Coordinates of C-alpha atoms in Angstrom, one line a residue:
Chain F
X251 CA 275.2 232.1 65.1
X252 CA 278.9 232.3 64.2
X253 CA 280.4 229.4 66.2
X254 CA 280.0 226.6 63.7
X255 CA 281.9 228.7 61.2
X256 CA 284.7 228.9 63.7
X257 CA 284.8 225.4 65.2
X258 CA 283.8 223.4 62.2
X259 CA 285.8 225.3 59.6
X260 CA 288.4 227.8 60.8
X261 CA 289.8 225.3 63.3
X262 CA 290.8 223.1 60.4
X263 CA 292.6 226.0 58.8
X264 CA 294.6 226.3 62.1
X265 CA 295.3 222.6 62.2
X266 CA 296.8 222.7 58.7
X267 CA 298.6 226.0 59.1
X268 CA 300.2 224.5 62.2
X269 CA 302.0 221.9 60.0
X270 CA 303.3 224.5 57.5
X271 CA 307.0 224.4 57.0
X272 CA 307.9 227.8 58.4
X273 CA 305.8 227.7 61.6
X274 CA 308.7 226.3 63.5
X275 CA 308.1 227.7 67.0
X276 CA 306.0 226.4 69.9
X277 CA 303.7 229.4 70.4
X278 CA 301.6 228.1 73.2
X279 CA 300.7 224.9 75.2
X280 CA 297.2 225.9 76.2
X281 CA 298.1 226.5 79.8
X282 CA 298.3 230.2 80.6
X283 CA 299.4 229.5 84.1
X284 CA 302.7 227.8 83.1
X285 CA 303.5 228.3 79.5
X286 CA 306.7 230.3 78.8
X287 CA 308.3 230.3 75.3
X288 CA 311.6 228.5 74.7
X289 CA 314.4 231.0 74.4
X290 CA 317.4 230.7 72.2
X291 CA 320.4 232.8 71.3
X292 CA 323.2 232.7 68.7
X293 CA 326.2 233.2 71.0
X294 CA 330.0 233.0 70.8
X295 CA 333.0 233.0 73.1
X296 CA 334.1 236.0 71.1
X297 CA 331.1 237.6 72.8
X298 CA 328.3 238.0 70.3
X299 CA 324.9 237.6 71.8
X300 CA 321.8 237.5 69.6
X301 CA 318.5 236.7 71.2
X302 CA 315.9 235.2 68.8
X303 CA 313.1 236.8 70.9
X304 CA 313.8 240.4 71.9
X305 CA 311.5 243.1 73.3
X306 CA 312.0 246.0 70.9
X307 CA 308.9 248.1 71.0
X308 CA 306.8 248.9 67.9
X309 CA 308.6 248.1 64.7
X310 CA 308.2 249.3 61.1
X311 CA 306.6 246.0 60.1
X312 CA 303.5 246.7 62.2
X313 CA 303.1 243.2 63.5
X314 CA 304.1 244.1 67.1
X315 CA 301.2 246.1 68.6
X316 CA 297.9 244.2 68.9
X317 CA 294.5 245.8 68.5
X318 CA 292.1 243.5 70.4
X319 CA 289.1 245.3 69.0
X320 CA 289.6 243.0 66.0
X321 CA 287.4 240.7 68.0
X322 CA 284.4 242.9 67.3
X323 CA 284.2 242.8 63.4
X324 CA 284.6 239.1 63.6
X325 CA 281.7 238.5 66.0
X326 CA 279.5 241.1 64.3
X327 CA 280.6 242.2 60.8
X328 CA 281.8 239.0 59.0
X329 CA 280.2 236.3 56.9
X330 CA 281.6 232.8 56.7
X331 CA 281.0 229.9 54.2
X332 CA 279.4 227.8 56.9
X333 CA 277.2 230.5 58.4
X334 CA 276.2 232.1 55.1
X335 CA 270.8 230.2 49.3
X336 CA 273.0 229.0 52.2
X337 CA 275.0 226.4 50.2
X338 CA 278.5 227.6 49.4
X339 CA 281.5 225.5 48.3
Chain U
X107 CA 243.8 192.2 33.8
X108 CA 247.4 192.8 32.9
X109 CA 248.3 195.0 35.9
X110 CA 251.9 194.2 36.6
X111 CA 252.6 195.9 40.0
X112 CA 250.4 197.6 42.5
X113 CA 252.1 199.7 45.1
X114 CA 250.9 201.7 48.1
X115 CA 252.4 205.2 47.6
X116 CA 251.9 208.5 49.4
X117 CA 249.0 210.2 47.7
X118 CA 250.1 212.9 45.3
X119 CA 246.7 214.6 45.2
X120 CA 247.0 215.3 48.9
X121 CA 250.7 215.8 49.4
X122 CA 250.6 218.3 46.5
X123 CA 253.3 220.5 45.0
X124 CA 251.8 223.3 47.1
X125 CA 253.3 221.6 50.1
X126 CA 256.7 221.4 48.4
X127 CA 256.6 217.6 48.2
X128 CA 257.8 215.7 45.1
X129 CA 256.5 212.1 45.1
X130 CA 257.7 211.2 41.7
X131 CA 260.7 209.1 42.8
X132 CA 258.7 207.1 45.4
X133 CA 259.7 209.2 48.4
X134 CA 258.8 212.7 49.6
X135 CA 261.5 215.3 48.7
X136 CA 261.5 219.0 49.7
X137 CA 264.1 221.3 48.2
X138 CA 265.7 223.7 50.7
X139 CA 264.6 222.7 54.2
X140 CA 267.4 220.9 56.0
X141 CA 270.3 221.4 53.7
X142 CA 273.8 220.3 54.9
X143 CA 276.5 223.0 54.8
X144 CA 280.1 222.5 54.1
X145 CA 279.7 219.9 51.3
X146 CA 279.9 219.5 47.5
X147 CA 277.1 220.7 45.3
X148 CA 275.3 217.4 44.6
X149 CA 275.5 216.3 48.2
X150 CA 272.4 218.1 49.5
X151 CA 270.0 215.6 47.9
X152 CA 269.6 212.9 50.6
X153 CA 268.5 215.6 53.0
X154 CA 265.6 216.3 50.6
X155 CA 264.2 213.0 51.9
Chain M
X208 CA 290.5 202.8 79.1
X209 CA 287.3 204.7 78.1
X210 CA 285.1 205.7 75.2
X211 CA 284.1 209.3 74.4
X212 CA 280.6 209.6 72.7
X213 CA 277.7 212.0 72.5
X214 CA 274.6 211.5 74.6
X215 CA 271.4 213.0 73.3
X216 CA 269.1 214.8 75.8
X217 CA 266.3 212.5 74.6
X218 CA 268.5 209.6 75.7
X219 CA 268.4 210.6 79.3
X220 CA 265.2 212.8 79.6
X221 CA 261.8 211.5 78.7
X222 CA 258.8 213.8 79.2
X223 CA 255.8 213.8 76.9
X224 CA 255.3 217.5 76.5
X225 CA 258.9 218.7 77.2
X226 CA 261.0 216.7 74.8
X227 CA 259.8 214.6 71.9
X228 CA 261.1 211.1 72.4
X229 CA 259.1 208.9 70.1
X230 CA 261.2 206.5 68.1
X231 CA 259.9 208.0 64.9
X232 CA 261.4 211.4 65.6
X233 CA 264.4 209.6 66.8
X234 CA 264.8 208.0 63.3
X235 CA 264.2 211.4 61.8
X236 CA 267.1 212.9 63.9
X237 CA 269.1 209.9 62.8
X238 CA 268.6 210.8 59.2
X239 CA 269.4 214.5 59.7
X240 CA 272.8 216.1 58.7
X241 CA 274.8 217.7 61.4
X242 CA 273.1 221.1 62.1
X243 CA 273.6 224.7 63.3
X244 CA 271.3 227.5 64.5
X245 CA 271.7 228.9 61.0
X246 CA 270.5 225.7 59.3
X247 CA 267.6 225.2 61.7
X248 CA 266.5 228.8 61.1
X249 CA 266.7 228.2 57.3
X250 CA 264.5 225.1 57.7
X251 CA 261.9 227.2 59.7
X252 CA 262.0 230.0 57.1
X253 CA 261.3 227.4 54.5
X254 CA 258.4 225.8 56.2
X255 CA 257.0 229.3 56.6
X256 CA 257.7 229.9 52.9

């Protein structure tokens, strides 16, 4: 019931967001078996070493931990313009 | 005498408004059956055919 | 060197009571907007209405 709203609408939103100016990283290549993110550092002979990607545990921003249960409201507690009288701009 | 055009149309008295059909424009047209989704407000109309 | 395309079940199967395959219903499908289970259900709710 919900799939057309994903594939035929939300996917377009991903395709555009992917070209946004600030989405500068390559997040994934679609191959779980081999994909590994590119890893850069600011670094100097004076000995500074700043990784761009660090493992720092939960942060104040709250973006770090992932509740996968978010999957549930989506499948069974959300309307969409394509899925749901049924015309909607 | 004086008839200008004689057409063979679907019969309004049988395909009545009770069946949803609207024969006035020379084709059957039912309102909210197979509406397209994801399109602008005037774009449903051809599906009415 | 290849060409991707859809292939309708009616374009491979043909069985009189299984899968309608008459050219008329083929043309009817040709005139249909792209659909979804939601749209189909809406159509059925309308014919019931």
